Design a protein around this ligand. Sequence first.
Ligand SMILES: O=[N+]([O-])c1cc(C#CC[C@@H](O)CO)cn1[C@H]1C[C@H](O)[C@@H](COP(=O)(O)OP(=O)(O)OP(=O)(O)O)O1
Ligand SMILES: [Mg+2]
Ligand SMILES: [Mg+2]
Length: 540
Amino acid sequence: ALEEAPWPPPEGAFVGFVLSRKEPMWADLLALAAARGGRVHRAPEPYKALRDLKEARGLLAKDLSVLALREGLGLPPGDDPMLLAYLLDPSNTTPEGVARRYGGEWTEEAGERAALSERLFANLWGRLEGEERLLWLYREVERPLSAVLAHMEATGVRLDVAYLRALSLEVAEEIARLEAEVFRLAGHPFNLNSRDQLERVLFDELGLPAIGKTEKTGKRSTSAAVLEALREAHPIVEKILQYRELTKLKSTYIDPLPDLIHPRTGRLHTRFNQTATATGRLSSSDPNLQNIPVRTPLGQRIRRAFIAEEGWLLVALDYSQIELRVLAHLSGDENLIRVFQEGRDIHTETASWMFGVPREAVDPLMRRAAKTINFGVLYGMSAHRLSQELAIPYEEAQAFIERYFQSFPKVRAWIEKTLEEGRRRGYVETLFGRRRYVPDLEARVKSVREAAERMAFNMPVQGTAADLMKLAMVKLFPRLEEMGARMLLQVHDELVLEAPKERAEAVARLAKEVMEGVYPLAVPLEVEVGIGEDWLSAKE
DNA sequence: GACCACGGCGCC
DNA sequence: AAAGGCGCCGTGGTC
Ligand SMILES: O=[N+]([O-])c1cc(C#CC[C@@H](O)CO)cn1[C@H]1C[C@H](O)[C@@H](COP(=O)(O)OP(=O)(O)OP(=O)(O)O)O1
Ligand SMILES: [Mg+2]
Ligand SMILES: [Mg+2]
């Protein structure tokens, strides 16, 4: 039992803290404590006590650092046993689970959290002795990345609130036009947001053909993929699909985001969760700014609401065909390496083939559709689904996924090699040695085993791309600070920066070069960069 | 007011 | 719906 000692703690103590709510930019700091050398220090008043700390070292360090930044204090995050645990096994995503697994209990009291941070760090650091590549990821990627994310979180992004308020009222009237039409076509009103009520209308009352079933409960599905297949069978289907687009966008983005502007900053603040995915990707939450719309016209209007501070510009940088370049390097395939030493475009080539269109005329919306295909195909799509996704006979679907792989021969050999390894060692790994455990590779149920296989051989690709982006963020951040620029958002293979208008061009050039040269591969990494007043206009 | 499962769907 | 990775919505049901 730790000796209760007076605040403040010595240098290097492990911190524990309790927030009123999970979001650091919104939380009240209820209690603060620290632990070292067999002592626990409980702060009499936690906000004032923040100033005594040189570094947030402990569980969820980045969250406390964001809160410190909100208060104008430079309290960078350091060691965090969650990052160690996450690198050992990315299923380690919560403090509850990590505590249970590596020697304690996550409670609701700062002193115990500080003591727990200290014990867990000792034990996890032991487990990582001799895992030289994981230790490198920790010291060279994750631990410094957490500083970057804290600054992104605390900086936020500006949003055109008035513009969105106006858009809500317009979309509201159109939703009423669509719903009124649906209720007439059904002969009666019902809750069009209830997929159970819609299922009855569509397949019992109107006797439309039920195509597919839902996964867990076996209901007749009303998914867009099912509705797409029925849009000719009935005019109500078309209106329902339009109703779904508008209500999805209004309820998820248009209406909520303007209520989340922070009173102190006047900006919108997401969270970049650093121990949340099986592959090493970041995730974004509260709100998720990694799934802001972009595909449809209305979606594009929402994206335009993300704007630069007055007298600044946004700079948007996006890696080209990133996971395909990573695949070329991991596999060694020559026909593929060649494709990227020759600056060819496959999302354009596919978009030309599936549209019967010269590459000159593949517009931005055709190229996305081709990304569904190329990635859908590569990570294990079925001929049958493929035949449906791009509307061609099944026999055609088989051909695309046969030429898609014989054109690039040594991919399949890399797949087989990755699965064999994952079976023997129990995990697969990225170029840098990030691991994902995939136990079901020897499941005796084919469907389970084969799903495990698609998860296992995807991870080195998606996770290497994630390692590269994280490393680029870590390299780029100090260069932006020196140029008075900011890092705002990451969206997996994309960064959005904010720069003074007078240095925006120099920032964009520098950023592009840092990202392309992050870690040279057997193919070049290319980055598309754009500058604009709003997120959309900054992607050309 | 809280929680969860589910279907559904937004992005990468 | 049908052979990768996420988080948030409304419904429905529950406590
Ligand atoms: O299954 N996936 O793995 C996947 C699907 C999608 C998608 C999509 C299109 C629509 O959802 C919206 O239109 C993306 N991924 C992965 C692979 C890609 O490499 C990386 C970065 O995604 P993205 O930048 O969009 O593609 P990519 O870098 O290749 O090409 P660009 O040159 O920048 O256009 O995420
Ligand atoms: Mg890209
Ligand atoms: Mg992208």
